[PDB]
Amino acid sequence: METILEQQRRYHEEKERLMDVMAKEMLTKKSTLRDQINSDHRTRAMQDRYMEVSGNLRDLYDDKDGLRKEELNAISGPNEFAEFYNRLKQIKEFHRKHPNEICVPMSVEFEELLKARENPSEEAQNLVEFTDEEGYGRYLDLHDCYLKYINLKASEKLDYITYLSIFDQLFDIPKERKNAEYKRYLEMLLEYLQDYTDRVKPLQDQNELFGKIQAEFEKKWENGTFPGWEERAQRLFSTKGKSLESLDTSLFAKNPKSKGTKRDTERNKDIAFLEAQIYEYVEILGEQRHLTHENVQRKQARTGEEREEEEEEKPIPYWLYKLHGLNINYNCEICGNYTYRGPKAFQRHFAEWRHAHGMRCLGIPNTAHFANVTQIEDAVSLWAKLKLQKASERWQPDTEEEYEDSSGNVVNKKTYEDLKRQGLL
Amino acid sequence: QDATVYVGGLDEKVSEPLLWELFLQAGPVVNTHMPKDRVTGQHQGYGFVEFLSEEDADYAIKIMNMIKLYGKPIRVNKANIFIGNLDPEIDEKLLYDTFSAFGVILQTPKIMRDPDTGNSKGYAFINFASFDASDAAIEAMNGQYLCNRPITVSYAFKKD
């Protein structure tokens, strides 16, 4: 197999087709937010497929460095080419043209008029990754988080506006203790906010953003990210102040700070990382949180009907009728129980198209024998009769013939026309 | 329709038994049909020959194609620019290849057909890429010697 010649060119053509599909998706205008989110998800899937194809093609270079000495040699050539042509010289009886060598990846990376989705992305749906209250990235669902906060606080003195004001803080004082059970709800709220940020922009590099957030948490947040003018240096894990930078560096490797506490850097590191991720998601998606707060205020200020509307978004002459055999209708089962009108009209009906069609359904030809016959079983019985009659009255030489084979040559004249061939074979 | 062959380009010398006698050497032509006009009461140049087998109709279409019968381009077939008095022996691909020498064609051309026979009506419509190809067709192709039929190219729509 030509893995360096044919497979690399096929991977390059697939990457070029993916880039052309991405350019055609980016050049087209958008009209709705859900269709734009679906197009962004399809572009992210196409970019992931192109990255996987490039990673698969980038690993096919180990044998190429060994085969380049034989491929670039001018002493070789038409011997192996003639051997491959003799291998390609098989029977060409498969008379079938295949124009889908390059048209099939072009049609797989395209959409239809009824549904604007690609062929690998035909099973993708925007309702399986986002809820109806979010609006495909327009707002964020915070009713379950507010219910969990009200269940954890064990008090009914916190509304949605108070929860939105408590969640709007980034570096202020927290509402509860840092060593309490509110960190278990804050980690879930951070894991939901990370999925909401990853769903609001599928075309952005989530791995590079996660690596940058981890680098900012390790190199900056773990080394005093909030300087002061106890107020000079504050620790997020130990929740205590520091006199100077040397005292904080000496206390960073201390025994209560490492593992000798309940909020040290060994056990409470994941909660601090989740709090830093929640702060980064609140700083990056503050406009979506403000839009969700404005939508919650508009839903609270509205009435019941406004909230329901927001959640819902002349006759023939007596002579013609008596003289013409009319007023009498004849029906025929062979013709869909089609009811025909007066004597003369019915007679033609058996010769007309509809009756021939109805008769073909059973497989019986239309002849003069099957006239004035309107029922099915009568037709099939008369067809059996006519078949028996005609088949009888023909001359069938196969069963009707008297051969006397030369096996005994003076006996056995009861041989049919088939046993004679079997004896003479 | 498969066993019948539609003939186009018949003059006044050709008749209904004459086409069956001329098509008798190609195959067993069972019947001949000639639609008469309403204003003149004669044939409009297009007729049909219903044979017994489809192979005889295929041989008549491959043998009597673009023939000069009665001083007319008779041809048998399987039954903004305006071109008139065109020969029925040419197809859409043949007209696209003939129009490709003057200018570039925007798409595949279309030829008008009769509602009864459906082989050839007599006029066709073709669209060019620009007005220069239309002017070259009105200067050169409007009057060029086609296959035994003087065609006439004209503008379909023009604004004064």
Add this chain to the structure above:
Amino acid sequence: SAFDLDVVKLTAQFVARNGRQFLTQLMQKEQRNYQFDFLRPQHSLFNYFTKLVEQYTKILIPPKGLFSKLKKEAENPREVLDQVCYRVEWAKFQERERKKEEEEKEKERVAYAQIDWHDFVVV
């Protein structure tokens, strides 16, 4: 049409490894009693065979995957998005140039259909 496409791909793979324009693995095969009608430029398949030979020559580039590894197209979606935006801008510029050429052709057709063709002067 699979056998002819495979023969054209084999000819494009054997012709791309040549060290000269006429000293290839297909010019000597023509004198070796091997019928190859796709080598002549008069056929319509020669335009596809030339594109296949160009793709085989572009598959032998040093950034094509022979002695180097691509990092911008394989490990950066932002670079691919910028390349797609540049391709969309180039397609929009080509469409604008085609519209300007069509407008110039319409202006030339309007000027040619309004000039006086009766003022003839033979010098």
Add this chain to the structure above:
Amino acid sequence: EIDKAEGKFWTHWNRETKQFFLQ
């Protein structure tokens, strides 16, 4: 007929030197 009088086929107009040629 010895040539072709088409505009887009066998004519040229260099606007840099303002030279018109037709063959």
Add this chain to the structure above:
RNA sequence: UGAAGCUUUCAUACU
């Protein structure tokens, strides 16, 4: 596409 029958106060023609 088509089916023009029956009757008289008509009126008009032929035996």
